[PDB]
Amino acid sequence: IPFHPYYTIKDILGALFMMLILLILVLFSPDLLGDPDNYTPANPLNTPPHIKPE
Amino acid sequence: ATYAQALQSVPETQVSQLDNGLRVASEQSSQPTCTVGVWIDAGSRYENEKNNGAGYFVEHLAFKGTKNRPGSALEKEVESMGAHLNAYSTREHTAYYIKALSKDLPKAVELLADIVQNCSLEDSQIEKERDVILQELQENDSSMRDVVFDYLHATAFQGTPLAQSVEGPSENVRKLSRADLTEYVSQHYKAPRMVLAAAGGVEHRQLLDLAQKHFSSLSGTVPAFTPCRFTGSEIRHRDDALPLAHVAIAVEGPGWANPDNVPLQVANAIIGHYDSTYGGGTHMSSTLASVAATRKLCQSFQTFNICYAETGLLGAHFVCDNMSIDDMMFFLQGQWMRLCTSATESEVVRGKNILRNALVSHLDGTTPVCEDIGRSLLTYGRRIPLAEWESRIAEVDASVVREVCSKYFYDQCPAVAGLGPIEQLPDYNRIRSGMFWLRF
């Protein structure tokens, strides 16, 4: 089938759903997936008890 | 004459009626030959799914013998005077006519009454014609235009008796009995639904006396017609073994008696027609014809205004190779849009001239005039004179064309038929979006 009418609209719906999840994160739990210790400025003398990547 | 005096000098169609309700209509000339026929308000749209094909079967058996003229005798009589017997059937009309010498009109008229009144419908002949009709169905399968228009009717009028084909499905052909055909004739071959037309060296008083002597037996003074819903829809039969693709696209157009038909026909003349055997090619005033000739986008295209009593198919049929269908759609729909929004006076003038020329040139000979009389009395209850057609064309301008093409084409769902190597036939949503313009 041609991409335009079908998958442009389907990809738009998918993008709106993705935007919903993203804005739920940004506006209702901004810090859900982050770490509180990055609200502390970097201290090369003191190391955090836990050093995890993202 | 100045074509205004020539229209005013065209002979007048004289119409009378028998007590049974058979209408008698004639346009007289000084020609030594005439065409006389019977036109009947009978077609496939009057058939349901069990009887579908009965009218075509009855037309098949029409000349194969009556109780007075058994088998070949009728044919012999026709052939023994130099006359020509012809018949046809549509979804709404049926016709039986003779081209004869003017001195053969009595016999011709007699030969017609018998044919419509006393067909033998003999079972042996019914089986022979069963075989013939099956072979003709397979012959019609070979004609891509006939198939694509049957497809267009089937999807545009799905669920309605206008979707039916004239010939019916082959299963009905195998199943139709003599009782089926006798019932069809007894319910549809009635005097109030028949018109005895004659064009040529025929005096109306003499034809009327003939009709009163040969047709007065017919039904004196009931199931007929339900409207047929139109559907925006598509039917695509892909056969990449076919060398060329056929595409037919139509919106719901007006029925017979709607005045909108005259401007719409004008508009169709603006789009015109084309095939690859044309002299003019790239120089044609029709934009689509010149683009098709310059790019070799198609082998042919035609506009059409098919009318039924209450609806019709207004559209275009084109034939092209697999890799150009899309282009042919784009330039065709664009023309439609260009007419809905920006019709322009000069090409409306050209289309009006084309329409007048089509109407006058079509009515050349006794047979086209006889068909015009019969079909006209069936569709309008009247023969519309060419002076009147000219009055209706003269009152068309670019505003009128813009308005009517907007009313019928713009933002309307079309019905679409595709047959052959049609992978590049655009998806229905893309065509439907091609039925409006965002700039407008």
Side-chain angles (χ1 to χ4, degrees):
Chain A
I1 65 177
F3 190 92
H4 162 46
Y6 297 101
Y7 294 115
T8 57
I9 202 60
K10 188 170 179 184
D11 285 358
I12 279 168
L13 180 64
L16 201 55
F17 265 105
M18 201 196 67
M19 279 317 285
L20 175 53
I21 301 312
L22 178 54
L23 295 174
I24 284 166
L25 285 166
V26 172
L27 304 164
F28 288 125
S29 66
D31 295 323
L32 193 64
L33 301 183
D35 199 300
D37 298 276
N38 233 42
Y39 286 104
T40 310
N43 189 351
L45 276 307
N46 181 53
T47 189
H50 204 305
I51 297 178
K52 52 165 67 51
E54 294 312 72
Chain B
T2 57
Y3 163 82
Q5 313 194 240
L7 288 177
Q8 283 294 110
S9 266
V10 159
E12 173 195 358
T13 305
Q14 205 149 342
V15 195
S16 292
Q17 217 192 57
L18 310 184
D19 306 23
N20 37 286
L22 173 85
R23 285 167 291 167
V24 183
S26 67
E27 191 164 279
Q28 186 169 2
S29 322
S30 43
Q31 313 154 290
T33 64
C34 66
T35 294
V36 58
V38 187
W39 272 259
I40 325 166
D41 259 321
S44 92
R45 86 169 293 173
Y46 299 87
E47 297 156 358
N48 74 97
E49 78 285 313
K50 80 152 278 185
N51 204 237
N52 191 196
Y56 183 72
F57 214 121
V58 158
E59 173 205 340
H60 262 276
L61 298 169
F63 318 143
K64 303 304 201 282
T66 62
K67 25 158 276 191
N68 316 81
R69 269 159 278 272
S72 57
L74 160 77
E75 180 160 11
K76 200 161 312 177
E77 271 156 32
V78 168
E79 288 165 339
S80 197
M81 41 163 56
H84 297 255
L85 200 40
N86 202 46
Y88 66 82
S89 293
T90 66
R91 289 174 173 84
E92 61 196 320
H93 301 309
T94 294
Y96 304 115
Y97 61 92
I98 304 179
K99 308 180 62 214
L101 290 193
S102 283
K103 70 170 193 58
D104 296 327
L105 181 82
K107 187 134 281 204
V109 161
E110 194 205 88
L111 288 187
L112 285 175
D114 213 9
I115 287 169
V116 301
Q117 271 163 240
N118 304 126
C119 190
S120 265
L121 294 176
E122 286 171 1
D123 308 344
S124 315
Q125 197 68 41
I126 290 168
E127 313 307 326
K128 314 152 71 53
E129 279 325 305
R130 206 182 304 279
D131 299 315
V132 179
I133 291 166
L134 294 168
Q135 323 304 300
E136 268 159 31
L137 277 177
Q138 315 178 36
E139 293 175 333
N140 292 355
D141 272 300
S142 63
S143 183
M144 271 185 88
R145 193 223 189 249
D146 292 328
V147 175
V148 74
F149 278 94
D150 280 327
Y151 284 172
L152 186 70
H153 276 92
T155 201
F157 301 123
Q158 57 193 245
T160 84
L162 212 52
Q164 291 170 155
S165 73
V166 167
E167 306 79 5
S170 64
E171 41 276 30
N172 281 338
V173 178
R174 305 184 183 103
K175 282 335 150 184
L176 285 163
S177 72
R178 182 186 204 266
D180 296 12
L181 315 170
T182 36
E183 216 207 60
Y184 180 88
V185 152
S186 187
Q187 65 197 355
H188 300 299
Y189 281 24
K190 315 216 79 62
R193 290 169 62 183
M194 295 170 147
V195 175
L196 180 65
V202 48
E203 150 185 340
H204 180 83
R205 196 250 201 169
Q206 181 218 308
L207 177 65
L208 191 56
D209 258 312
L210 293 171
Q212 193 34 41
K213 191 189 100 84
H214 292 307
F215 284 98
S216 75
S217 51
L218 265 182
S219 47
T221 301
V222 171
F225 171 84
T226 36
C228 287
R229 164 199 66 199
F230 172 92
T231 318
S233 52
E234 52 175 9
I235 177 175
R236 311 154 92 105
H237 183 177
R238 187 155 162 193
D239 198 343
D240 295 333
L242 304 182
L244 296 165
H246 282 230
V247 174
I249 179 167
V251 293
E252 188 181 347
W256 279 116
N258 196 322
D260 286 354
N261 274 311
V262 176
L264 288 161
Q265 290 174 57
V266 168
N268 270 1
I270 291 168
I271 306 182
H273 44 112
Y274 176 76
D275 57 67
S276 51
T277 60
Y278 272 21
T282 76
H283 296 326
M284 292 174 86
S285 307
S286 159
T287 305
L288 185 65
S290 46
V291 176
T294 305
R295 301 199 41 188
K296 288 171 171 332
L297 278 179
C298 74
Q299 302 296 293
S300 65
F301 77 79
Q302 53 154 120
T303 43
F304 56 80
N305 195 36
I306 305 153
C307 287
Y308 298 103
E310 84 292 358
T311 175
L313 296 176
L314 160 67
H317 163 240
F318 67 83
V319 185
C320 74
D321 80 345
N322 54 327
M323 290 319 288
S324 49
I325 310 185
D326 206 79
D327 268 344
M328 280 307 306
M329 200 49 87
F330 162 77
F331 296 104
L332 167 67
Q333 300 196 283
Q335 283 310 297
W336 285 341
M337 301 293 101
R338 185 188 64 68
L339 281 179
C340 301
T341 68
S342 45
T344 290
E345 291 284 359
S346 296
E347 81 205 342
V348 162
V349 169
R350 191 228 318 161
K352 285 163 58 166
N353 277 344
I354 293 163
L355 189 51
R356 314 166 155 112
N357 269 299
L359 297 157
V360 161
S361 82
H362 161 87
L363 295 169
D364 200 4
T366 67
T367 290
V369 180
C370 194
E371 179 195 1
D372 199 44
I373 296 162
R375 177 219 55 74
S376 292
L377 258 71
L378 294 180
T379 49
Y380 315 119
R382 63 196 277 255
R383 181 89 194 280
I384 306 164
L386 270 176
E388 183 167 326
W389 292 110
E390 182 49 25
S391 309
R392 301 181 188 271
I393 305 171
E395 66 209 10
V396 173
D397 40 55
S399 86
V400 172
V401 167
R402 269 188 312 271
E403 169 188 328
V404 73
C405 294
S406 282
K407 174 182 168 183
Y408 285 95
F409 276 118
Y410 194 81
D411 206 24
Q412 304 287 343
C413 300
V416 181
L419 178 59
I422 63 173
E423 175 182 281
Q424 200 202 78
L425 177 67
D427 167 82
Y428 189 80
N429 279 296
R430 307 288 303 258
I431 319 180
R432 183 58 185 83
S433 279
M435 295 297 288
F436 68 85
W437 266 356
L438 299 169
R439 72 193 89 168
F440 183 79

